[PDB]
Design a protein around this ligand. Structure first.
Ligand SMILES: C=C[C@H]1[C@H](O[C@@H]2O[C@H](CO)[C@@H](O)[C@H](O)[C@H]2O)OC=C(C(=O)OC)[C@H]1CC=O
Ligand SMILES: C=C[C@H]1[C@H](O[C@@H]2O[C@H](CO)[C@@H](O)[C@H](O)[C@H]2O)OC=C(C(=O)OC)[C@H]1CC=O
Ligand SMILES: C=C[C@H]1[C@H](O[C@@H]2O[C@H](CO)[C@@H](O)[C@H](O)[C@H]2O)OC=C(C(=O)OC)[C@H]1CC=O
Ligand SMILES: [Cl-]
Ligand SMILES: [Cl-]
Ligand SMILES: [Cl-]
Lengths: 470, 470, 470
């Protein structure tokens, strides 16, 4: 049973942790010499696109309050903390000739030594959507294949400055979301595809360039750093469990496999076999870029581990100019007869379905044969409500149950044979939630926006410490 | 023509300034030894009563940023600035035995010296609704008449500490509003009037205690300080022009004059002749307290100048257990025959009626025969809109026009023989707006809540500087 | 005689001074939150275009050493100092929504109070080529007419922050050089015209937009600031004396008038009469933009004074796809029979011809009828020589004679009837000289690049103090 799950149900080397990303927590957007990212410009030029018209200029101020975040982490007692570096903080002009920012480097070094002083292992992500405005403006950012070399320079700086203490790297986090909402729906930065954007072509190019940036950085680590620093490198993917609306309709079963193909296979097959998935070549056809054979050779097996981010699940059925959305030829169902696949969380797109994580995990292992997996993101948001006082606000039973059920399911997946090495809840703190602004709370630590972002643990944090301390 | 109005249309001694109140701008609610006010407890225990569930903990942080505000005021170039002292900042327990807070005193001395170093005269208000919670919890704040002595100790403290530099004092600002929304409607702190409250009685006791508090303090200043410090003391009243729905119906001319009595007369009659107005005694009867004759003797003439606050206007006509609102026996109407008395501003209760200020001014001199008047508040809010970028947000055309029109009308009232010595715009900064939270913007200085409350002047400020500098 | 010229040869109100521009002296390119200008990017991306491949990242560090520069200015004893603000220092994203940089504002306030503490009048230039990279990248900077509104926002900030102490403003300095070398020759930033650039069209558009930016800012000052702040506003133009190769050839005489038309008339006629000069309409024809009539009304008489920058002179004769260079249809001669118009300075393009300044001054007064003139730039560079020790290096007799002869000629122009109100030597310090890097020294104060930019006065500085002190 789930409510009894605890650290002793897992192997000794298993790792528990929490996470954040730079733009959602740091603030200090124009402090310590940081240059602007595309999220800075998007939130400031297109405030109508953000709930409340807000931005992450200050966010929850971890730039200044990191000593406090570290204390929280020490009190929480878990093994590891996942965070990302802001590219334009260390390189404000995105490329080397734009200047190297010592002060931004000093910030991450302080954060990292702080965590190590306290027995907390840092897991570091190079990239979480925050493309330096300078590169976006000079050559369209990830639209251009120039992005691959600049990203490499960026990565080499990080390995050089931090790699003596950081032993666990990830190139990208959730590239799917960046591609799709950046270039297909236009809801996220840079906000294209609603020249001006083409949901039919751009997403495929962006993704193509993401994968090459990732493979080049991995080759760079492996050939120039791994032997001296002895770390490991990988990548983190968005996933959603895709379930056949009708378990009988072989048509529905294939729609579900195709949906997986277009979300996770899009990224996973290239680093497994060096190529896009069959179904995408078929349905996308000539709008889908091709890898030179030496590229395929670089991509193939370009990782030491893979992380999966899981939130929700869905029923899939077949569908009946172009765009990524329509190329998939599926339709999404939440109800199987006015019977929802699971209950709503605070967000109407997030339906709670614990077994989804067990299935995605088993599927990933079987389909792609990954030797080593971490769950790098998993969590839920509180029902919105500005009426509660802190004693009420902090009682987050839904999240508490959500975490138990999902962690229990991760344990199942390991019995099923999947080599899962760790699990990170998302997120540490309530923070900036992109298009949703500050209205949506994902943190195990509450934040009081009315009082300098005072931090206070929620019952889930207390529970994680008690059940998983070490 | 209003758009041409400028300093040279006024006598040389005429004073121009802006204003704030402590709880709306300061923040530092628990910093530097401040104790809690009733507004602190209200917003924190009843967040459902505030748009957004927000409070004044940080507000716009003038507590830490007061140097910038002073620099803004120097650039603005007007003669004077009107602010209030937070009672529970200088005396955290409200009464002397609660402790005298040196840091609180030091803050105001720093503020006052900065203003004077820059040639800006301070006009200081002892009280603006922020009753120390300790006095509220010990004896019901302004319900009890103990409040009069405590208020007196508070006042003496301020005169002794600051009276060498501050030469213009006001005991209270907007007491009407405190009484009515505090104890009749129960929308503002302490939030009483559905013991749990009683809109039939408490409002009248509260007003009774407010006036005795004001009179005690004026006797104190006048007997013990005035000769040595040579300052002046006064008080500041809420006003709203009241127009007879039908200029003819001599019964409407009556509903109007009765609406005046119940708003402005309720406070001005006592300091004029020592008693409440007839209309009020008749309709309220025995629920309305009496003044001992020594009290009447103390109240009568208790001021060196009066300040009027004016925002809007209304049509009044006659009406059809007990409650202040029903005791008035009037109904308010916004239009004659589908025509609004004036256009809306960002706020639906605020209709723009420049002529009301001329009228209110003339009425006041005529009915109560005040020899010296200041307009202590007058301003309007922006239309809410989180979609605008700063260069759009700062074009505050409506405010600019509103200021010009009201200032023009004040100038007319002077031609009519009313002796006005100055006018203060409300308010200097966008800030906390009580039940409205941060959603409503009254500042001539824009405030960016996403980025540490960055301040930036609106066109109204630039126009004030250019048209009234000296 | 020239060598005897001194302050007593001039009227009492006459003003003497020195000058610099932001990018040439400040450094601190990425300090205190400054954003990049087009000169940052040009020098860093195209180092081959700068002698030595250097840039102004540190320059002569006046950002950090300004207290020392102020001491020098105090020792030098002249009335005034001319400097420019770095647009992207106060607005790092060029437009308001890119963030207002308090720290950059604080720097100029410190500089300005420093100068005022010492009896030195500040003359301030809004713009000296340093276009914020953000605006160049978003919409092509001065190619787009969007530049006019952003430039206005920028100007309003400056007037608001500094206008209480700065009483003498200039919108642009040397716009000619910016247009021509930015867009016709491509030698300076942004380096176009060698899409990709069109020397035939772009220079004319850039210039057109410069003039509108200037006229809008002047309208802004005059309508919204001048009455409260009581300052004055103007602009500074490049000039070169143009002399008929053959004093007889009426053909040569017209070539000279046409050359003046294309250098100085290009800017001067629009603010005099509201239109470009006749000769340019003729030779440029339909490639020359046109002013709407309300634009002409804005431009006409848009200045309180004009400053002229004079360095050298030339002989002009007639010439025999498109480009600004060829549109002029003149040829430049330095020799009148192997007899050079004047001797070389350290730069082969700079030929010393003192009477040139007297003629340009008289010509400007007669042709355009300007009531009030300042010479805002005038000076010469030392022969390059890295072999001299400081005692030798500082003996700058050529500059000393250059200054005497030119100042003498300014005095002549005033006898000739021109109302000249002041004269500023260029420059205060040796500094970054654009395409020439650090190899070229224009300062009256020597700089030691080998030793933290130690400052040391040259004989010319000593002479100016002695002869013009006050
Ligand atoms: C909405 C954003 C992403 C989400 O991106 C994550 O959202 C979190 C909450 O806003 C963020 O805190 C986090 O940065 C991001 O990984 O990742 C998962 C999604 C999903 O549908 O499940 C598969 C997407 C939501 C779908 O509409
Ligand atoms: C709503 C608050 C007060 C208002 O009180 C002022 O409100 C400002 C805006 O919220 C405040 O910033 C300020 O503290 C206060 O003086 O003063 C005038 C009112 C009126 O009806 O016209 C006479 C009241 C509004 C009536 O419903
Ligand atoms: C070379 C740059 C400009 C020069 O620009 C000035 O050059 C100085 C020396 O490099 C600079 O310090 C200064 O910024 C600038 O005003 O202004 C005058 C020129 C001229 O030919 O005389 C009319 C130009 C030189 C001609 O080739
Ligand atoms: Cl580079
Ligand atoms: Cl006491
Ligand atoms: Cl803007």
């Amino acid at each position: 049973d789930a409510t009894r799950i605890s650290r002793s149900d897992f192997p000794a080397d298993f790792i528990m942790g929490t996470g954040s990303s730079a733009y959602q927590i740091e603030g200090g957007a124009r402090d310590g010499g940081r240059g602007p990212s595309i999220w800075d410009t998007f939130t400031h030029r297109r405030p109508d696109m953000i709930r409340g018209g807000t931005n992450g200029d200050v966010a929850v101020d971890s730039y200044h309050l990191y000593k406090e975040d570290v204390n929280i982490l020490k009190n929480l007692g878990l093994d590891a903390y996942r965070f990302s570096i802001s590219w334009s903080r260390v390189l404000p002009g995105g490329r080397l000739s734009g200047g190297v920012n010592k002060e931004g480097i000093n910030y991450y070094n302080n954060l990292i030594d702080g965590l190590l002083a306290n027995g907390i292992k840092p897991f570091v992500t190079l990239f979480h959507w925050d493309v330096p405005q300078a590169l976006e403006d000079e050559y369209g950012g990830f639209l251009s294949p120039r992005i691959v070399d600049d990203f490499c320079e960026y990565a080499e700086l990080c390995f050089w400055e931090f790699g003596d203490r950081v032993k666990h790297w990830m190139t990208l986090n959730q590239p799917w979301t960046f591609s799709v909402h950046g270039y297909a729906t236009g809801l996220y930065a840079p906000g294209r595809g609603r020249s001006t954007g083409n949901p039919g072509t751009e997403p495929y190019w962006v993704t193509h360039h993401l994968l090459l940036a990732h493979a080049a950085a991995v080759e760079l680590y492996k050939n120039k750093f791994q032997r001296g620093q002895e770390g490991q490198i990988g990548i983190s993917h968005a996933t959603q469990w895709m379930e056949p609306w009708d378990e009988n309709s072989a048509s529905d079963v294939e729609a579900a496999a195709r949906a997986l193909d277009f979300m996770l296979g899009w990224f996973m097959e290239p680093i497994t076999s060096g190529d896009y998935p069959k179904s995408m070549k078929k349905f996308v056809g000539s709008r889908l870029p091709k890898f030179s054979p030496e590229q395929s050779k670089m991509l193939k097996g370009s990782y030491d581990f893979v992380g999966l981010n899981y939130y929700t699940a869905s029923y899939v059925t077949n569908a009946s100019n172009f765009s990524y959305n329509t190329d998939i030829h599926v339709t999404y169902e939440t109800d199987r007869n006015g019977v929802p696949i699971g209950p709503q969380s605070g967000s109407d797109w997030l339906l709670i379905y614990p077994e989804g994580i067990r299935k995605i995990l088993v599927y990933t292992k079987k389909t792609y044969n990954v030797p080593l997996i971490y769950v790098t993101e998993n969590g839920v948001d509180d029902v919105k409500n500005t009426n509660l006082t802190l004693s009420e606000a902090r009682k987050d039973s839904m999240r508490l149950k959500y975490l138990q059920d999902h962690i229990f399911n991760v344990r199942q997946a390991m019995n099923d044979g999947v080599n899962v090495k760790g699990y990170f809840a998302w997120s540490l703190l309530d923070n900036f939630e992109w298009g949703e602004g500050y209205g949506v709370r994902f943190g195990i630590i509450h934040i009081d926006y009315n009082d300098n972002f005072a931090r206070y643990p929620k019952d889930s944090a207390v529970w994680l410490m008690n059940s998983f301390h070490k």
